[PDB]
Amino acid sequence: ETTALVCDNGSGLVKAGFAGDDAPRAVFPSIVGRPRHQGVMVGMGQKDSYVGDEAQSKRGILTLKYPIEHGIITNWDDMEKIWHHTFYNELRVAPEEHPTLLTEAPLNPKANREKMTQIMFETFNVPAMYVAIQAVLSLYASGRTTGIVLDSGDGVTHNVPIYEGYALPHAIMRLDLAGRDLTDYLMKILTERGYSFVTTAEREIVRDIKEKLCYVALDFENEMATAASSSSLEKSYELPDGQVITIGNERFRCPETLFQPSFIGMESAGIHETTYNSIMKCDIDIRKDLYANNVMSGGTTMYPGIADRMQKEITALAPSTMKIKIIAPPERKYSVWIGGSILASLSTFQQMWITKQEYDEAGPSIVHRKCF
Amino acid sequence: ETTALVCDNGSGLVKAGFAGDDAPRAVFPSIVGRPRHQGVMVGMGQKDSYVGDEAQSKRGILTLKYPIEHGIITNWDDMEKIWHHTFYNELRVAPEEHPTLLTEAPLNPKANREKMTQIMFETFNVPAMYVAIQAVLSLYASGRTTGIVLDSGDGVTHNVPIYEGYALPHAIMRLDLAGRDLTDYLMKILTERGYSFVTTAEREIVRDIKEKLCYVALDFENEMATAASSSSLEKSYELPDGQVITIGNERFRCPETLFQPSFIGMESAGIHETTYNSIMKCDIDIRKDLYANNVMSGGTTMYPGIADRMQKEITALAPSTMKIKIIAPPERKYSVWIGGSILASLSTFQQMWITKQEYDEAGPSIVHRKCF
Amino acid sequence: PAYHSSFLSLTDVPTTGNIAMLPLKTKFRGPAYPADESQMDIIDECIGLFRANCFFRNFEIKGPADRTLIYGTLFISECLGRVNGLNYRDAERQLNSLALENFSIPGSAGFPLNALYAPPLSPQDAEIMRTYLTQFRQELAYRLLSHVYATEKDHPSKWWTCFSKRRFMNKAL
Numbered sequence: 001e002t003t004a005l006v007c008d009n010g011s012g013l014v015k016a017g018f019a020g021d022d023a024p025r026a027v028f029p030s031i032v033g034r035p036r037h038q039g040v041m042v043g044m045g046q047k048d049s050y051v052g053d054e055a056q057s058k059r060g061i062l063t064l065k066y067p068i069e070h071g072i073i074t075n076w077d078d079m080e081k082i083w084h085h086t087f088y089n090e091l092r093v094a095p096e097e098h099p100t101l102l103t104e105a106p107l108n109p110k111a112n113r114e115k116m117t118q119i120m121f122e123t124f125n126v127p128a129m130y131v132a133i134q135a136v137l138s139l140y141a142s143g144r145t146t147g148i149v150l151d152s153g154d155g156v157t158h159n160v161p162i163y164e165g166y167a168l169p170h171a172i173m174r175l176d177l178a179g180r181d182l183t184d185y186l187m188k189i190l191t192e193r194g195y196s197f198v199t200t201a202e203r204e205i206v207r208d209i210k211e212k213l214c215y216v217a218l219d220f221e222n223e224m225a226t227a228a229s230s231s232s233l234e235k236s237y238e239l240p241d242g243q244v245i246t247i248g249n250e251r252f253r254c255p256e257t258l259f260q261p262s263f264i265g266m267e268s269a270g271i272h273e274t275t276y277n278s279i280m281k282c283d284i285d286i287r288k289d290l291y292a293n294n295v296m297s298g299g300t301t302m303y304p305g306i307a308d309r310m311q312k313e314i315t316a317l318a319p320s321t322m323k324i325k326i327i328a329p330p331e332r333k334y335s336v337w338i339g340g341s342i343l344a345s346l347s348t349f350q351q352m353w354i355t356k357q358e359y360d361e362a363g364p365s366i367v368h369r370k371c372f
Numbered sequence: 373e374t375t376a377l378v379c380d381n382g383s384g385l386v387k388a389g390f391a392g393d394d395a396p397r398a399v400f401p402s403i404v405g406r407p408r409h410q411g412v413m414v415g416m417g418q419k420d421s422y423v424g425d426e427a428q429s430k431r432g433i434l435t436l437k438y439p440i441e442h443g444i445i446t447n448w449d450d451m452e453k454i455w456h457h458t459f460y461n462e463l464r465v466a467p468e469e470h471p472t473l474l475t476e477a478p479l480n481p482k483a484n485r486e487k488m489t490q491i492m493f494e495t496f497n498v499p500a501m502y503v504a505i506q507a508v509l510s511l512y513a514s515g516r517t518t519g520i521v522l523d524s525g526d527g528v529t530h531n532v533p534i535y536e537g538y539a540l541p542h543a544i545m546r547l548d549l550a551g552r553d554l555t556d557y558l559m560k561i562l563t564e565r566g567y568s569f570v571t572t573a574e575r576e577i578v579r580d581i582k583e584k585l586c587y588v589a590l591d592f593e594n595e596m597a598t599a600a601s602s603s604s605l606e607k608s609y610e611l612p613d614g615q616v617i618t619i620g621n622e623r624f625r626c627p628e629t630l631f632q633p634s635f636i637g638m639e640s641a642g643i644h645e646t647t648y649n650s651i652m653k654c655d656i657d658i659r660k661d662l663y664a665n666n667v668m669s670g671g672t673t674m675y676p677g678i679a680d681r682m683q684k685e686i687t688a689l690a691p692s693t694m695k696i697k698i699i700a701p702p703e704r705k706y707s708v709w710i711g712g713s714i715l716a717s718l719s720t721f722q723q724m725w726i727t728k729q730e731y732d733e734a735g736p737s738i739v740h741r742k743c744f
Numbered sequence: 745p746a747y748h749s750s751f752l753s754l755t756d757v758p759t760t761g762n763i764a765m766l767p768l769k770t771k772f773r774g775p776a777y778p779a780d781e782s783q784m785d786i787i788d789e790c791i792g793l794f795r796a797n798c799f800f801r802n803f804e805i806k807g808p809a810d811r812t813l814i815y816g817t818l819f820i821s822e823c824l825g826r827v828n829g830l831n832y833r834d835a836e837r838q839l840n841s842l843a844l845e846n847f848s849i850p851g852s853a854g855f856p857l858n859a860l861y862a863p864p865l866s867p868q869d870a871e872i873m874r875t876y877l878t879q880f881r882q883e884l885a886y887r888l889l890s891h892v893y894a895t896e897k898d899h900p901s902k903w904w905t906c907f908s909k910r911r912f913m914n915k916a917l
């Protein structure tokens with residue numbers, strides 16, 4: 001086989017490309033657009049739908065509809081059309097003669113996996129693929145073979161403790177709070193200052209604001225005390241229309257929701273406390289590397305000042321007699337892809353695909369008994 | 373001159389080395405532990421079983437299980453694996469190049485010894501081997517000729533009284549209470565303190581606790597009474613996780629079971645009383661010599677303060693006229709191996725081997741014919 | 745003890761270090777030039793002659809083809825020691841996994857037969873030797889699996905695995 005495609009099916013973005021390298025050959029938001037206007041002027045082929053960067057650019061007169069909600073696909077038609085876009089208009093390769101690599105969050109419904117693999121078989125006529133949890137891909141990106149991995153994507157945040165060469169399925173825990181919920185909370189709290197953001201285009205604008213302005217509080221009460229005399233923390237940003245805004249404590253109050261999920265009315269421990277609980281749920285001995293290897297992946301885990309806050313929280317919760325260090329590579333966006341490409345390029349993996357020949361009689365149910 | 377392997381496959385450790393060495397050069401726990409997790413991780417050549425120090429180090433995700441139960445072999449395949457490890461990965465000597473010297477507890481089942489010699493001849497193709505007794509080798513290592521040898525290892529506790537040369541076979545008393553039972557009792561009595569240890573890894577942890585935080589009180593009732601003013605009795609222990617343990621009367625209560633076997637529900641006399649019973653089983657003349665020659669042995673007898681208590685109890689039991697002397701060499705941990713190495717390098721011994729041709733022509737009953 | 749590879753008489757055969765680049769038939773990927781489909785290749789003759797070579801204890805080498813035969817014999821001994829008591833699909837999985845493992849090569853410290861096998865001359869020679877040995881042992885394992893289950897499916901034939909404990913030349917991978 002010449003090459004092997006790897007398609008990181010992210011909840012908010014899409015990562016794709018060939019094996020071996022690391023640079024993403026195709027990155028674009030996972031969005032399908034539907035126009036919501038008459039369009040009196042007629043000509044040059046007014047298409048019925050827009051995807052990717054084209055939809056992102058033309059969002060002015062479009063309704064942006066995400067196809068994945070909390071790591072679960074719910075718009076299968078839009079999803080297969082996005083996959084068509086990825087394999088034709090972005091990678092410019094024929095899917096009929098290349099193995100694929102798909103990424104799925106842990107604890108996802110089995111129906112999602114079966115229908116994904118059956119669609120990839122039938123609609124695309126692909127030789128084989130694999131469905132691996134993105135935690136092991138993050139671990140490959142880190143290069144090590146041991147340590148709990150905190151993954152915080154756009155829809156779902158999950159932790160997977162993996163000791164040397166073995167994983168603990170009973171200790172795997174996930175949370176339904178992620179970047180999309182953070183964006184929604186930021187959009188809600190911006191209204192306190194009078195700003196209005198309701199349409200999905202305004203949601204994208206708020207997402208960009210969170211992208212390039214927000215940061216994690218090292219000490220929540222201390223920074224509230226500092227913001228009482230709000231003179232330096234205030235920043236500014238320009239909207240696409242042209243009018244300028246100013247964001248004060250809302251800059252760091254919205255990513256604080258990760259550590260206090262009660263802000264958005266969810267009863268659940270923060271990311272730090274969930275990581276601590278997942279580690280303590282593990283066996284009494286394997287906790288060494290689990291304290292000493294906290295691999296953070298995902299786009300949401302790249303706020304300017306999240307690593308130190310997480311380290312402080314875990315140090316405070318855990319016993320003081322042993323060290324806790326946080327691993328956070330600068331290439332944190334694409335660690336899942338890097339791990340996927342490394343796994344695909346491994347020689348030992350060449351016989352662990354789910355080939356079409358075996359599917360010809362096994363059926364879509366083979367995915368659970370082959371990938372797990 | 374005629375170097376021979378000396379393998380003392382004790383119930384808790386496998387002490388091995390060449391004949392004539394001052395101390396054994398191969399000591400490691402007798403544990404074979406398979407992984408108990410799915411292990412979705414691929415690569416790194418994850419083995420299917422780990423033996424010895426590797427198993428102890430990886431015990432975080434391993435199902436450790438001893439292949440021997442109270443001196444009797446119950447996991448013959450696991451014991452063959454352990455023997456292969458000892459011969460190749462630890463001593464690095466071909467089995468068919470040097471003879472071996474084994475030990476087994478008195479009154480053991482005959483099939484155990486028969487299968488032991490059968491395996492070591494059929495499988496490893498060793499030239500010759502001998503099956504001695506732990507008490508005899510302890511007498512060798514003590515540099516004496518008479519006296520009753522109290523041997524208490526991980527598996528079983530046994531006394532073999534030996535006069536000048538001659539050993540009385542009708543006065544051998546064997547008691548199954550041993551270090552593993554003491555460890556189990558320690559696990560049970562740590563629950564009442566609050567700390568819970570369940571799995572095999574926690575069993576190794578509590579064995580490590582007893583390794584260095586336990587002793588035998590010279591007096592029991594007074595020690596328990598003065599434990600009420602808990603000042604100089606308890607002292608903390610650092611658990612592998614990081615939280616600290618604090619054991620009080622548990623320090624000396626779990627080794628007390630040796631002298632009071634009723635704690636674990638056994639209608640048997642303690643070691644202090646069974647020694648006197650074994651002495652009284654002998655003839656009326658050799659008892660005076662046996663009183664003044666008490667050879668302590670085994671790894672269980674390394675409790676700081678056991679010799680004094682044993683001497684006091686035996687003095688109380690025995691008539692007050694003659695003196696009771698107890699022998700506690702500082703190196704009595706490896707006394708059986710020292711005696712085996714001493715015996716192996718003796719000129720008269722080469723006629724006492726079981727040559728390969730003799731076994732081939734005689735079947736597996738030659739060990740009963742010759743060894744004992 | 746006079747049994748030797750029939751391809752030691754080959755002329756103009758390419759070589760790396762002191763190991764011949766003998767032709768091989770396989771469905772795998774590697775540098776070996778495909779051989780005729782109606783002949784008696786190196787792997788087939790090595791498998792056929794292993795059951796008699798593993799009993800000798802004195803071998804005199806005549807050329808690089810003998811080195812290839814010795815390497816094949818060592819791999820066959822290893823596989824027979826590993827394939828014991830398994831299924832068919834599990835057997836192919838385990839043997840492919842062990843064959844693809846990053847093993848020791850002549851010129852390295854871990855090679856037991858470093859005395860007889862010369863180190864590669866150049867890094868390119870080292871890499872071509874790497875791929876040659878990988879392809880060779882992959883195809884050898886495939887052929888051995890094909891031969892040993894010639895009668896049943898769910899269990900290895902005990903006649904062919906009774907040689908597992910036989911330790912050919914007392915030196916092997």
Ligand SMILES: Nc1ncnc2c1ncn2[C@@H]1O[C@H](COP(=O)(O)OP(=O)(O)O)[C@@H](O)[C@H]1O
Binds near residue numbers: 011155298
């Ligand atoms: N530097 C950054 N600052 C703030 N947020 C970021 C940054 N980089 C990425 N994000 C957020 O991370 C999200 C992308 O996560 P992604 O890697 O797509 O997860 P998944 O692949 O699981 O969908 C985006 O919604 C974005 O808001």
Ligand SMILES: Nc1ncnc2c1ncn2[C@@H]1O[C@H](COP(=O)(O)OP(=O)(O)O)[C@@H](O)[C@H]1O
Binds near residue numbers: 524552582
């Ligand atoms: N210093 C010590 N203090 C307390 N217990 C010990 C000490 N050394 C060894 N032991 C106990 O002795 C046991 C080992 O006995 P061992 O000498 O291996 O007997 P055998 O060789 O017959 O198995 C271990 O289970 C351990 O709990």
Ligand SMILES: [Mg+2]
Binds near residue numbers: 153154
């Ligand atoms: Mg993701």
Ligand SMILES: [Mg+2]
Binds near residue numbers: 506523525671
């Ligand atoms: Mg012993």
